[PDB]
Design an enzyme around this catalytic site. Structure first.
Site, PDB file in Angstrom:
ATOM      1  N   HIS C  60      44.049  -4.633 -19.967  1.00  0.00           N
ATOM      2  CA  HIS C  60      43.087  -5.647 -20.373  1.00  0.00           C
ATOM      3  C   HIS C  60      42.928  -5.691 -21.901  1.00  0.00           C
ATOM      4  O   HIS C  60      42.213  -6.537 -22.430  1.00  0.00           O
ATOM      5  CB  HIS C  60      41.744  -5.485 -19.638  1.00  0.00           C
ATOM      6  CG  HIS C  60      40.837  -4.451 -20.229  1.00  0.00           C
ATOM      7  ND1 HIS C  60      41.093  -3.098 -20.151  1.00  0.00           N
ATOM      8  CD2 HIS C  60      39.658  -4.574 -20.885  1.00  0.00           C
ATOM      9  CE1 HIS C  60      40.111  -2.432 -20.731  1.00  0.00           C
ATOM     10  NE2 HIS C  60      39.228  -3.303 -21.185  1.00  0.00           N
ATOM     11  N   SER C 198      38.938   1.636 -24.898  1.00  0.00           N
ATOM     12  CA  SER C 198      39.801   1.304 -23.767  1.00  0.00           C
ATOM     13  C   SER C 198      41.285   1.516 -24.045  1.00  0.00           C
ATOM     14  O   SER C 198      41.804   1.077 -25.080  1.00  0.00           O
ATOM     15  CB  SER C 198      39.537  -0.125 -23.298  1.00  0.00           C
ATOM     16  OG  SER C 198      38.497  -0.138 -22.337  1.00  0.00           O
ATOM     17  N   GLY C 199      41.943   2.225 -23.124  1.00  0.00           N
ATOM     18  CA  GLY C 199      43.354   2.527 -23.265  1.00  0.00           C
ATOM     19  C   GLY C 199      43.567   3.880 -23.909  1.00  0.00           C
ATOM     20  O   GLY C 199      44.612   4.497 -23.735  1.00  0.00           O
TER      21      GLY C 199
END
Ligand SMILES: *C[C@@](*)(O)[C@H](CCCNC(N)=[NH2+])NC(=O)CNC(=O)[C@@H](N)CCC(=O)O
Lengths: 247, 122, 248
Positions: C60, C198-199
């Site tokens: 995402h 995120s990630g």
């Protein structure tokens, strides 16, 4: 006449040999403070030196520089849902030790009301070096490894270990500066831990308790040959005094 | 009992960065760097490591001037043969020194460096 | 470690019980930590250097543009804003999403990164490896604070692995934690790394090096009570990952 400081209004507990140790007599350690963020949990401790001034540990103030985001809880025993007379003042100014040592001063936006449940701690004589095996008390609502007490104010009586010894290869291997002290049982089991930081390491000297340490760091909690490290307040009583007199 | 320490040989930098008139300016919390047995530790690499550590406490501010004549880079372990404790010790120099083995006795010996270094601040 | 292996930092990581709610890390103690940047604009997502030419992230994080040469990875960083000298900023050649997706994708670096003591890949786990209950893991990332705050400096946050049996135990999450998902943190919170991270990696220590046991994808709050964070279980997709690199 009158007098206070270091003379708690409840004879403190007693448990020879925070992870380990034992829960304290509710109000036997009046100078203990509890740093808690605005609408946020308790995360460190502190100790009241003056009705206005609180001595803590600079790494607890790592999150925000804004005094405004810090709150002080005085006169408690319970970490969760304190008694109705527990005071909760807010921080006015943050004063970290300038050379980056793990110590700092919190100015209260309103002085702490002194009560028999709230009394400052006595400061040490500058540069004084706590003896070798002297038994001191560490207190606070820090974590633990599933042991005896918890949401209550636990305590522990640990023997001081001199830098000379604690910097030995089996122990701390020279990571202890002259400005820090060690306290613990080489066997482990009892010790301070995360959440206790900033709290006092009080050593009884004749009639009162003298604030001889600020909980700061350590290799794990209660692990053997790994005592707890504390900032030596005697090496900062002049600086502390300076901040208080000029602020 | 797993509240960790370096698993292999490590250099441990615990230095009080003061000025020239001795006055303290920075007291960076110690930091340990993994060093391999066999490599050579020169005056240069020590400084790459003293800086590496001053930045960990006061990031990118300050720079080193004079490390300090006292080459306080000693290592201590227990000698299972002598049945006593040995405290090796090396010098901080342009020529350096090869990192000894010591596995024979210690799994994770710490080559401590504890000196006041003159930093000026960028 | 010899030369520059994997999962072996060249400075000892500053541990801290606990990105938000975690201490600022020692510079370059998380050499695999990457920062994704838009063509002109700056940070928005983190990542893990899986190999000199491959980076693993949260799918995402690629919502803005399908094109691979739209993102730029930054390697060897501590400062997210200003950015110092040797801080390699590679351009991305191709993007490989993971099929039967949870949230992961592979970013292929047009130029193999230069492996030094500040830039080193992470070790991948063995297939379906199951990171044990209570294992001490580390959440690392610049992402947010007082919104955009974050000292600009790379922060971490130590979190223990829960256990998909207990994590799913009604009183917090209901079998919403699948077999391909990893549950770590605690049921009290005040350190769960959230957003803009995120990630980023979730590297758990093992014997002497660090392993990429999970990818920061989500949590369900932002550091708190009975709600352990939920990272995609990387040992499940270690095969796919592996097979992307051998071919692509
Ligand atoms: C900040 C304070 O809450 C805790 C107290 C832990 C006391 N430890 C022992 N053994 N009594 N302090 C810390 O967490 C500071 N960090 C550490 O002790 C180590 N995790 C790192 C050491 C360092 O780099 O300062």
């Amino acid at each position: 006449p009158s007098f206070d400081c270091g003379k708690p209004q409840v004879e403190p507990k007693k448990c020879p040999g925070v992870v380990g140790g034992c829960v304290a007599h509710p109000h036997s350690w009046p100078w203990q403070v509890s740093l808690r963020t605005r609408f946020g949990m308790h995360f460190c401790g502190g100790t009241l030196i003056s009705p206005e001034w609180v001595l803590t540990a600079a790494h607890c103030l790592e999150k925000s520089p804004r005094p405004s985001s810090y709150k002080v809880i005085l006169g408690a025993h319970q970490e969760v849902n304190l008694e109705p007379h527990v005071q909760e003042i807010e921080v006015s100014r943050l004063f970290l030790e300038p050379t980056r040592k793990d110590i700092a001063l919190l100015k209260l936006s309103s002085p702490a009301v002194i009560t028999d449940k709230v009394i400052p701690a006595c400061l040490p004589s500058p540069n004084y070096v706590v003896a070798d095996r002297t038994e001191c008390f560490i207190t606070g609502w820090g974590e633990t490894q599933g042991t005896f007490g918890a949401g209550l104010l636990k305590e522990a009586q640990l023997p001081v270990i001199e830098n000379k010894v604690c910097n030995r290869y089996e122990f701390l291997n020279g990571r202890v500066q002259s400005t820090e002290l060690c306290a613990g049982h080489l066997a482990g089991g009892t010790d301070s831990c995360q959440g206790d930081s900033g709290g006092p390491l009080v050593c009884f000297e004749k009639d009162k308790y003298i604030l001889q340490g600020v909980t700061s760091w350590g290799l794990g909690c209660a692990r053997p040959n790994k005592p707890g490290v504390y900032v030596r307040v005697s090496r900062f009583v002049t600086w502390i005094e300076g901040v208080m007199r000029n602020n | 009992a797993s509240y960790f320490e370096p698993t292999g040989p490590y250099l441990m930098v615990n230095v009080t960065g003061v000025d020239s008139k001795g006055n303290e300016l920075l007291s960076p919390h110690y930091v340990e760097f993994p060093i391999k047995p066999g490599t050579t530790l020169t005056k240069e690499k020590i400084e790459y490591y003293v800086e590496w550590a001053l930045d960990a406490t006061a990031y990118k501010e300050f720079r080193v001037v004079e490390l300090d004549p006292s080459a306080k880079i000693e290592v201590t372990y227990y000698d299972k043969n002598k049945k006593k404790e040995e405290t090796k010790s090396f010098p901080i120099t342009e020529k350096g020194f090869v990192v000894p083995d010591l596995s024979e006795h210690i799994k994770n010996p710490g080559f401590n460096l504890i000196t006041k270094v003159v930093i000026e601040k960028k």
